[PDB]
Sesquiterpene synthases (Shimazuella kribbensis), 714 residues
Amino acid sequence: QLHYPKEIENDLMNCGLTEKERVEILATAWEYVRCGVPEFTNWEKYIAFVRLTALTTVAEYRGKLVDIDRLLTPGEYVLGYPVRELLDTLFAGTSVYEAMLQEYASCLLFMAEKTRDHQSDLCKKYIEAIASSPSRYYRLRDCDAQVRLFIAAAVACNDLDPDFTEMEYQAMAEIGITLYDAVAFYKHRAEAEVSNLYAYCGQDLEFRQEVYQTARSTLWALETMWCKTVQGRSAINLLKNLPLIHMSMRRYRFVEDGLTIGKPETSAVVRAARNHVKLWYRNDAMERSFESVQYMLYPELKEALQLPITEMCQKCTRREVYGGVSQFGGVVLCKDSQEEWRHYVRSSESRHLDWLG
Amino acid sequence: QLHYPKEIENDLMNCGLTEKERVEILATAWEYVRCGVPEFTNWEKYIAFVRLTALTTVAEYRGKLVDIDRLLTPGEYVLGYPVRELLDTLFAGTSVYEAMLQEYASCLLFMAEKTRDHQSDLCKKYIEAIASSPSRYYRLRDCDAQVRLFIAAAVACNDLDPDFTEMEYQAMAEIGITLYDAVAFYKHRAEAEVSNLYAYCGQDLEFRQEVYQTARSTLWALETMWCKTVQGRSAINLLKNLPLIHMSMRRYRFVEDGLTIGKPETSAVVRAARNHVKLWYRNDAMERSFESVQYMLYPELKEALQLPITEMCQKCTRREVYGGVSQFGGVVLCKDSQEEWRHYVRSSESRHLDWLG
Ligand SMILES: [Mg+2]
Ligand SMILES: [Mg+2]
Ligand SMILES: [Mg+2]
Ligand SMILES: [Mg+2]
Ligand SMILES: [Zn+2]
Ligand SMILES: [Zn+2]
């Protein structure tokens, strides 16, 4: 059975969602916030965050329902949520307010673009951008998985002002995505996902085991250094729980898969994702444009969407339309590019030790 | 690499432990407390708890090193730890002080008895007692896995006095052990463990999936009801993280097993446990007596060790010596007894909803 707070139990009504979708979305949102932000003090901000996460959850598989262009507009209700009021409740008066408005809007924008019927030109630029370099992959995947957003929101929900540097967010996101994309590897290969680190680094278990071990070891060092402050724990709890949600949350298959993690995906799981079982989304193979959406983009994504075509790797394999054709759904790196990514991911420890002080 | 606080880095020296054992023990202890007690305010109590957990870790595979009879003695150092000073720091002035002295001492007593060369008569009485009824199994496994102890310690490490009722501890332990013993099922079958719920309930995946799903569902209900208080979260965090340590802690095999959970154990894992890889212990097939140890026993264990032989199930299969002969190592329930256990574990939801209000 699904459990969530009475405050939200009448949310998302009269929206175009069935009763079964509506209760699964509210439960997913609650369970994600609980797992990623286990320590909090401010219930008003916490529930506003859960509501923003319910809207994220809708965007992640039924993007057509979500009016991306009204998310940051004062007074606009999106599926009954006053989105900008919720973001102001969570972040107004913090040092990351403006950046997190862009982070949230940019996330749902490419959630909805990826979960659209017909692939837009803007969506194609995104899919080619996240394959352009491992550092770019990590920064754009941060927004897509809301890693820095959850870390900042967690601090905000303890009535503190997040004080992380840019290089601190970047180190933290690389650690968390290295772990999460490893656990999600078979889920994501079933979704014909573009957004998985190992779609670009390569699919050999040896590499995945190695960099998973290094990421979890760096995260234990970080936990040991940071566990005595509320901001430190806010960060630790999000990162450490990213890989663990596959066992703790009903969004995932631990029970249905016979109490296992890490069994390769089957065409059965492919069809489950297509039919939105656990609110998954299979990307099978333009209306929004750069010009219409660029106000909501954080700087690195705005740059990523305008990369000079003359500097794109020609030995990497592109497609006219991305997604599943019945693997991963995006660019296939050439051996030179793939070695650049594997090198970058293997050099994490030295990079992170520097960035994290 | 292994990470733990500078405070403990010179612990457990000149003890009969190698440098490799010593650093693995300190890391295990730190990682367990971090995972089970992620939210705390009192660093002095926290570090005292980590030290008590380091001593637990020694008892769990090399019990011969641990002088059980000096654990509760004021002024006694056990492997360099002032055990009673540490317990007083953690629990003196709480409502559970006396019960937790008995809980800790009783735990390490049967850790050391189970991890002994020659099986004692007292150890044989324990192994037959935990197979006597599912309720008795759960209460004695609570102490063995330190479930109520960790929950009470967590509250204590937030400078609060644990206020849980006896039926609250019992509900919480059944939830946590139902989850933990399921994830540990293959580890434990490799250890020829006696202390696994499914050794008694039966080994069919269907049953395990069902009761795992019910336990995790009840725990999400409990989290949703209790998450707004520090005592509530203290309880939630321990229970929810029990099954997850198999992915988060280096004590476990997630990385070495190719980033998987739930692959059946092999004779290779059996030999790993025997050779104490990750500080595991294989029980392969009397000096301490009831009279010498009964001062440290909590009431239900003192009763369990004196059960009338006339009331033991004769259709259950006992052995002169327990442990591996190259499965689970204890009593094998008869079909009548096994159905009593499966019935009890399937009736958890109604039992827990009552006990938890
Ligand atoms: Mg997704
Ligand atoms: Mg996504
Ligand atoms: Mg054990
Ligand atoms: Mg044990
Ligand atoms: Zn290339
Ligand atoms: Zn019987």
In short: The longest strand of chain B covers residues 77-78. Strands of chain B lie at 77-78, 81-82.
